[PDB]
């Protein structure tokens, strides 16, 4: 958030514009507003569409995480409703579902899931999970064996197994959607558009000065602020899985998921 830096440099560029207006018609240099109107409206259009895309990715990310909570709540719901007495199963599945959420956070944050895993699962499971090119996937497989074994033992039918299998499928879709949003970056343009906006804002006073004279800085900074604010919104929407204040609060969301699942299985945080 060196937007305040970019403003100050604008005020500076404005002063340089006023000062150097003295030599403007002489060097053979004239700068009108109308060409900058054209360019500025074009950039605003492009910024409008770009931000629209950024916003949508951020919302999709928030939604995918939304689905983790919904699908996990419902899997636990089904286990209790279908197998009310299998409390061991209840607890092991819950510990996989909770491990899934934390490991999803670690995967997207590019951090180590070991501590969280060790808190939740026996060490043999941790080892098996850590060895996988995709830990969240191994957890889904392991949650799968729990309902799998219940099915082998005749406690679930093929139908009731399928109802719960569908929830693991839904979690696979969340996993896939997040990995798609993480490793998605023509982000190359987000930077190009940014430099465009920067260059435009810094050239702008030079074009305004002929008309506004001493008023240049105020108008220049006002227009710069509007474009720079809008442009920086994109930047803040473009790393939804990051650690910045305006990124998704994944730690808090994992705590909510865990709290919900412990609540449903009669445990106290």
């Amino acid at each position: 958030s060196k937007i305040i830096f970019r403003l100050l440099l604008n005020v500076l560029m404005s002063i340089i514009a006023i000062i150097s207006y003295q030599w403007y018609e002489q060097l053979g240099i004239h700068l009108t507003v109308a060409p900058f109107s054209l360019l500025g409206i074009a950039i605003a259009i492009f910024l409008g569409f770009r931000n629209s895309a950024s916003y949508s990715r951020f919302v999709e990310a928030r939604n995918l995480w939304g689905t983790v909570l919904i699908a996990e709540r419902t899997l636990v719901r089904q286990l209790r409703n279908i197998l009310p007495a299998e409390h061991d199963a209840h607890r092991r599945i819950v510990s996989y579902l909770v491990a899934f959420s934390w490991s999803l956070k670690h995967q997207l944050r590019k951090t180590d899931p070991t501590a969280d895993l060790r808190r939740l699962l026996p060490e043999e499971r941790v080892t098996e999970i850590l060895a996988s090119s995709m830990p969240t996937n191994r957890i889904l497989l392991l949650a799968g064996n729990e309902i799998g074994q219940l099915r082998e033992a005749g406690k679930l039918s093929d139908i009731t197994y399928g109802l719960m299998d569908n929830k693991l499928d839904e979690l696979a879709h969340v996993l896939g959607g997040c990995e798609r949003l993480a490793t998605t970056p023509a982000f190359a343009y987000t930077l190009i558009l940014q430099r465009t906006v920067y260059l435009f804002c810094t050239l702008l006073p030079f074009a305004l000065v002929g008309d506004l004279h001493y008023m240049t800085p105020f108008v220049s900074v006002f227009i710069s602020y509007t474009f720079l604010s809008w442009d920086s919104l994109a930047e803040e929407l473009e790393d939804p899985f990051g650690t910045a204040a305006n990124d998704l609060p994944l730690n808090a969301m994992c705590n909510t998921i865990e709290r919900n699942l412990l609540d449903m299985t009669g445990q106290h945080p």
Copy 2:
């Protein structure tokens, strides 16, 4: 609204601009229209996309609430169609479905669900529900218990149980979606910045217009201002869909419809079932 204040303040700034125009050249200050055009067009473009995001949130809230009515109607339809004789289960499940709606409403309004729940559920359940940090979720789990019991007693097969389970799933998506929409909107921070940008734009505008319009300044300036502020205020009215304002969702009426709907669909006759 506060908009009439904003218009009147704009008239004032216009009159100041007319009367302070004289001192303009003396202070060496020019304000042309062209840079304000650029700025205004930029702001309008941004307001367009912003409002589009606001509208979408409101429409989603509305769809989520539409889903409750649909999912609950069909769950009751399925119970009557599949277990026509099981009136006690019908009444238990209906009262959970109605409790879910009211509970959802209270949670989003951050109001006390107690009256509505006491009105609908037996006391052993009501205290269990208010014991949770997640009452609405608890109510779904209890509705699930009902159909779970019909399964265990052989009244529902695994298949017919499945058909009803799927409807509990739809209600779960509603709960999750509503909860997501209830937390601070995405990039709210900017919506506030934009509003301030619009405010500053409207109030600086006459100073830009005056050199061209003179006394006509107030008329044109408040007109432009009304256009920008009306559009910007629409976004505020759309952003709290679960709020208590009249422009927000009539959640109370919606929960009444749901209740009346499910009561309509059931009732009458005793017998061992």
Copy 3:
């Protein structure tokens, strides 16, 4: 088409503006184009987005009606494919399905479904349906009973019952979707504000076009007003999809299509 009114109304102001221009200097009033460019462009942007929303609402209402035809077509196909000999059950269910659509139309037009119900259903059922304050919903429930009976009788299994149950769900989504779109549209209030803004703008516009256009004022002004008024009125047309106007959804025709479909050839099938 009070666009023809507003256009003439606009041609008046255009004359006024030609007869005043000189007298502007005497009253101390200048009105340049540029401020009106800014304001007109903003309005166009907001009109664009607003129309988009209106259009989306219209299209959704159209798709929901499409679903009625699709889901009713496939429910009857399932009955024919799974229980080919059960012609009595076919007739009964088909009449509920046909009653569903007409009942949905009446609900959305706020008209009396009594005649249509009596044409299709037993009187006992017509009274049952009219008793409900949600009659379309009651029809689905009644359609479901037919399917339910066939399952209790063991003619459908749980699986094949489930296949048909899904189609009743689909019709439930349509009922719900339509009820949602029938209620006063999102921020309807603003479409009325935008409408007034467009009007005022078109009215004030010639007063600011004179200085540039002189005599050409009424022509260019009426052209601009048509463009903005055309587009705004389109919103009006799209906003009430279940209305009775000629530009609203042809609900009677669509209900006729559904009926002819389900009764294709005295309801006979290979």
Copy 4:
């Protein structure tokens, strides 16, 4: 079809008129500045933008529905092969229905005679049943459904596997309804014509408004702008008839051939 080249020629002519008739503009009091035409052009571009968006989406939807036919038919055949590998008679019958469905859909949307295609694929008895119907394509689905219906009655399909295939007939029904929906007069088609006339009027007036500024340049600039608006506007009419036979409508014949070839490929024919 391509009447734009006309409108361009009419535009060059109005440019020549404008130049010639410019002098007499005074002593009448008729001026045309660019600025009000800037306002009008921009408003038109915005509306063209939104309108073309809807036209584009409708054409995309027509293409997607046809794509669903390929997908749903592939998988129905796949399912039949995988579930009943030995039942080649049923394979051939169901395939001929699925192929018949495709061609009949095309005939329906083109309002052409399906008879020869139907006869090349099905026995006369079935062709008779199909053509007797007021809704032939829908009746083909019913017949396809009776084929899988019979396999179910004979116990070769269980209810579960009958269900898997029934779902594909549902998809085909969504395609049929969707196409019938798209085949009817577009939402607000009337405005499309209104917008067209607006663009035409604007384009023919434009050179009168530029001549003041551009003199002899008028014809070249007015035609460049006119082309731009007319190119964009004519994209609507290019996208508004997806089922037609023009070069830029969907190649339904080739698509039906692709469908047929795929199904024949999958059944060793």
Copy 5:
């Protein structure tokens, strides 16, 4: 792009040194008409880019579904039939073959080496003999699932759960094939590109009256803004074109192979 920028500079010089001549003869270019046109062009490019982006997102989503569906199908095989490792390995081969085969089909490259490395020779012959190889692979995968069903190792229910996944892959195949053909408004895109090109080359002549020697600077900047946006659109429209960036597609086919070898304990290397 850069060649169109330098030509823009060259047109600007031509504009400066010739400005005097032509304006004398009664041929004027002002800024306002080019402002109208440029803004209209920008509006059109906005909408165009919007369609380009949406095609791109669909491609990403379709390939996302390959990973999801293939992962869950293999998970189902292990959860439902834990002991059936031969069947596991065969099906994994078909799934991995499907992905590589899809990529080859979309890129129009030769799938033979990927097929020959994954599958028995007889099966490769069958697949290469078909005009729809990727579809043939789906059919073969379905065969494996269908065989376990005939042997009564899958019930109809559990067979069904897996059949659903094969369906997801059928929708990926077709969506990608549809995306692979020429875009719906491709002809206009050619028109708009040329329209941007001509606008950029004429622009200096419209500016020079106002900017003089500054003309090459403002002209090159405006041009860059328009051509960047156009260029981005070109890339996005064509997620499987023969000019595409192959990194993500290759990445994805490798990720899924790795994932499935992991899931069937073919990794890591034994002790």
